[PDB]
C-alpha cells in the first residue's frame, strides 16, 4: 500500500523534532535516507525472507520491532512492527533515534551509506 509524506512536510517534521545535529547528522542525511529506504511511503514494506523492513525508515524485524514471524529476533525498540506502518511518525521517530544513537550515526541504513553519505545532498533540502 502507499501513503506518502511529501518531501517538504518530512523536512519540517524532522526539523521540528530536533533532527539537525542528532548524533551529528543533518536534515539532508535523513531526507536522502528516507528517499532511498521507503521513497517517502509510511507503509513501505519489504520482506527479504529472514526479516522484514517496515515504514518510512525501513526498520528491521530481526533487531528493532517485533512482527512475530522473524526467527532469531530481538525487539530493540520494544514495539510491534505494525506501529511503524501508520501516518503517525512518533513511533518511527523514537525508534530511528534509538537506532542512530546505538550506531552513533546512520550506518544502519544501507541506502544512506550507498546513495547519501559523502555526497552533495543540497537537492533533498532546498526549495521548502
Ligand atoms: C535485504 C536488505 O538489504 N535489507 C535491508 C535491511 O538489512 C536494513 O536493515 C538493517 O539490517 C542490518 C543487518 O541486519 C542491521 O544491522 C545490524 O544491527 C544489529 C543491531 O544493532 C547489529 O548487532 C549489533 O552489533 C553491535 C555492534 O555493531 C553490537 O554491539 C550489538 O551488541 C549487536 N546487537 C544485537 C542486538 O545483536 C548488527 O551487527 C548489524 N549488522 C550489520 C551487518 O550492520 C540494521 O540495524 C538494520 N537497519 C535498520 C534501520 O533496521 C534496512 C535499512 O537499511 O534496509 C533493507 O533493505
Ligand atoms: Cl541539511
Numbering used by the authors: -1 to 126
Q: How is this structure described in the published paper?
A:
Unfortunately, there is no density in the +1 subsite—a key aim of the experiment had been to observe sugar bound across the point of catalysis between −1 and +1. Sites +1 and +2 do appear to be accessible in the structure, and binding of non-hydolysable chitohexaose analogues, for example, with sulphur replacing the glycosidic oxygens, might prove successful if such ligands should become available.
Lysins (amidases, lysozymes/muramidases and peptidases) are such specialised bio-molecules. The term lysozyme, or muramidase, is broadly used to describe the enzymes that cleave the β-1,4-glycosidic bond between N-acetylglucosamine (NAG) and N-acetylmuramic acid (NAM) (or vice versa) in the carbohydrate backbone of peptidoglycan, Figure 1. In addition, we have determined the crystal structure of the apo enzyme and of complexes with reaction products (chito-oligosaccharides).
